[PDB]
């Protein structure tokens, strides 16, 4: 299922304990793309269907490859969309622990949104996973204003976007195994570290 809108569709009276907001890569389908569904099913295994809400970033985020060249690695409209989802999560479910992730342009989008987010909401993001992080070199493997211990970057050797280039090479498309194992493992561990 490449489209998940659990947060938007979800009943505030029955909020999940964990809300995962994910941004897909450039040109990917639905609002989850290729890696999101794998992370989602593993999160559901750990917390149960009603325990976690999967929300892809859709709406104004068109994941247009051309936008990788913009100052922040994505458009302003896209950042506004993801910021709005974090804000919707915060108001719709005040007590939920948040977790985030992004692939490619979605990773830049995730870093940009997190950097601009109000500190009170940003503190709620227990962990963030970034695959093929387009701003890896520029940001020194960090998300501005967000702790290193809550960040996990998956950058393959030979994935040029991780070393400052905009070229798409084979290793950029080899994150499947990470999304199936270490990425959700990291997210689960970080959520459990704060929620017990």
Description:
It is a single chain. The protein has a single domain (1-196), classed as Rossmann fold. 35% of the residues lie in helices and 15% in strands. The chain contains seven helices and five strands. It has helices at 6-9, 36-47, 76-92, 105-116, 119-122, 176-180, 182-195; strands spanning 18-23, 52-56, 97-103, 125-131, 151-154. It has a five-stranded parallel sheet, with helices on both faces. The two termini are 29 Å apart. Its main location: secreted. Its EC number is 3.1.1.74. Pfam families: Cutinase (PF01083).
Gist?
It is classed as hydrolase (serine esterase). With 196 residues, this protein is α/β, with parallel strands linked by helices.
What is the strand content?
5-15%
How many strands, which pairing sense, and closed or not: the largest β-sheet?
A: 5 strands, parallel
Helix content: 25-40%
CATH architecture annotation: 3-Layer(aba) Sandwich
Number of domains: 1
Total beta-strand segments: 5
Order of helices and strands: HEHEHEHHEEHH
Q: What structural keywords apply?
A:
monomer, 196 residues, five-stranded parallel beta sheet, 7 helices, 35% helix, globular, Cutinase 1, signal, cutinase activity
Annotate the secondary structure layout.
Blueprint: H1 6-9, E1 18-23, H2 36-47, E2 52-56, H3 76-92, E3 97-103, H4 105-116, H5 119-122, E4 125-131, E5 151-154, H6 176-180, H7 182-195
Parallel strand pairs: 1-2, 1-3, 3-4, 4-5
Helix pairs in contact: 2-7, 3-4
């Amino acid at each position: 299922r490449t489209t998940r809108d659990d947060l938007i569709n979800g009943n505030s009276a029955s909020c999940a304990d964990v809300i995962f907001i994910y941004a897909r890569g450039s040109t990917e389908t639905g609002n989850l793309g290729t890696l999101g569904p794998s992370i989602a099913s593993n999160l559901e295994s750990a917390f149960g269907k009603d325990g976690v809400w999967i929300q892809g970033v859709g709406g104004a985020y068109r994941a247009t490859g051309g936008d990788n060249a913009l100052p922040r690695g994505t458009s302003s409209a896209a950042i506004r969309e993801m910021l709005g989802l974090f804000q919707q999560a915060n108001t719709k479910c005040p007590d939920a622990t948040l977790i985030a992730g992004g692939y490619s342009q979605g990773a830049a989008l995730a870093a940009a949104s997190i950097e601009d987010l109000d500190s009170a909401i940003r503190d709620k993001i227990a962990g963030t996973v970034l695959f093929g992080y387009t701003k890896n070199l520029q940001n020194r493997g960090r998300i501005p204003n967000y702790p290193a211990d809550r960040t996990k970057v998956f950058c393959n050797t030979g994935d040029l976007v991780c070393t400052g280039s905009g070229i798409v090479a084979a290793p950029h498309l080899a994150y499947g195994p990470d999304a199936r194992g270490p990425a959700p493992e990291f997210l689960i561990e970080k959520v459990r570290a704060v929620r017990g």
